[PDB]
Write a protein that holds these residues in place. Structure first.
Motif, mmCIF file in Angstrom:
data_model
loop_
_atom_site.group_PDB
_atom_site.id
_atom_site.type_symbol
_atom_site.label_atom_id
_atom_site.label_comp_id
_atom_site.label_asym_id
_atom_site.label_seq_id
_atom_site.Cartn_x
_atom_site.Cartn_y
_atom_site.Cartn_z
ATOM 1 N N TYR A 145 2.159 32.558 -10.292
ATOM 2 C CA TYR A 145 1.509 33.601 -11.156
ATOM 3 C C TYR A 145 2.568 34.324 -12.001
ATOM 4 O O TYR A 145 2.452 34.415 -13.209
ATOM 5 C CB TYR A 145 0.842 34.589 -10.185
ATOM 6 N N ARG A 176 -8.854 38.364 -12.359
ATOM 7 C CA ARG A 176 -10.057 37.624 -11.854
ATOM 8 C C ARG A 176 -9.606 36.341 -11.132
ATOM 9 O O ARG A 176 -9.933 36.130 -9.981
ATOM 10 C CB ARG A 176 -10.909 37.307 -13.090
ATOM 11 N N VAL A 177 -8.830 35.503 -11.786
ATOM 12 C CA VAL A 177 -8.330 34.251 -11.117
ATOM 13 C C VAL A 177 -7.598 34.620 -9.814
ATOM 14 O O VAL A 177 -7.814 34.025 -8.771
ATOM 15 C CB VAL A 177 -7.366 33.609 -12.134
ATOM 16 N N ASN A 229 -4.987 38.336 -21.151
ATOM 17 C CA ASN A 229 -4.369 37.721 -19.925
ATOM 18 C C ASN A 229 -4.430 38.670 -18.715
ATOM 19 O O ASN A 229 -4.607 38.235 -17.594
ATOM 20 C CB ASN A 229 -2.912 37.409 -20.304
ATOM 21 N N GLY A 230 -4.295 39.957 -18.928
ATOM 22 C CA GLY A 230 -4.359 40.923 -17.783
ATOM 23 C C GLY A 230 -5.735 40.836 -17.121
ATOM 24 O O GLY A 230 -5.856 40.878 -15.912
ATOM 25 N N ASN A 267 -7.855 38.160 -17.431
ATOM 26 C CA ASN A 267 -8.018 36.753 -16.932
ATOM 27 C C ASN A 267 -7.221 36.541 -15.630
ATOM 28 O O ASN A 267 -7.679 35.891 -14.707
ATOM 29 C CB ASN A 267 -7.453 35.865 -18.053
ATOM 30 N N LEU A 268 -6.029 37.081 -15.556
ATOM 31 C CA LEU A 268 -5.185 36.910 -14.326
ATOM 32 C C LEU A 268 -5.816 37.601 -13.104
ATOM 33 O O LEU A 268 -5.982 36.993 -12.063
ATOM 34 C CB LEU A 268 -3.843 37.563 -14.687
ATOM 35 N N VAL A 298 0.971 31.970 -3.993
ATOM 36 C CA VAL A 298 0.309 31.994 -5.339
ATOM 37 C C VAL A 298 1.015 32.979 -6.289
ATOM 38 O O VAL A 298 1.014 32.797 -7.491
ATOM 39 C CB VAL A 298 -1.147 32.414 -5.064
ATOM 40 N N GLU A 330 -10.190 35.421 -7.453
ATOM 41 C CA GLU A 330 -10.922 34.148 -7.138
ATOM 42 C C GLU A 330 -10.215 33.386 -5.997
ATOM 43 O O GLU A 330 -10.839 32.693 -5.218
ATOM 44 C CB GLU A 330 -10.849 33.352 -8.450
#
Lengths: 105, 22
Positions: free
Chosen positions: A10, A77-78, A71-72, A74-75, A6, A81
């Motif tokens: 990323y 957390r995803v 984005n920092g 949002n990234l 991943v 996740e």
């Protein structure tokens, strides 16, 4: 919970748009500091503590000193996740090469 | 190849920059 693959996408997916908004320059620091804290004994255990990504998701962006653009947040957390938010360096090494490719053609 | 974590790049690009914008 070891999706090291991943990090490859990323580092790139996060770079793709980081280039359009000219973020790559300041964005390099965010990934450099983020990848440095994930490979930190104390931060490593804090990240791999439970199946809940929230405990390590907000904890990571917070220890960085809130210096991460949308984005920092949002990234991380995803990335959490998917059960692998601690793979920040896994993407950093990939991102550094993306810059060399962008700084070559 | 599009199916393993390596292909999530496009999904990431949409969430990394537009996660809370759906």
């Amino acid at each position: 919970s070891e999706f090291i693959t991943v990090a490859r996408p990323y580092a790139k997916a996060a770079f793709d748009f980081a280039v359009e908004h000219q973020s790559v320059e300041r964005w390099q620091d965010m990934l450099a500091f983020a990848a440095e804290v994930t490979k930190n004994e104390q931060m490593a255990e804090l990240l791999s503590g439970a199946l809940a990504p929230e405990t390590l998701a907000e904890s990571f962006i917070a220890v960085c000193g809130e210096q991460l653009d949308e984005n920092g947040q949002n990234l991380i957390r995803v990335m959490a996740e998917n059960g692998r938010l601690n793979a920040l360096p896994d993407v950093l090494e990939q991102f550094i090469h993306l810059r060399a490719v962008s700084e070559a053609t | 190849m599009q199916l393993n974590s390596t292909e999530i790049s496009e999904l990431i690009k949409q969430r990394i920059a537009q996660f809370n914008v759906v």
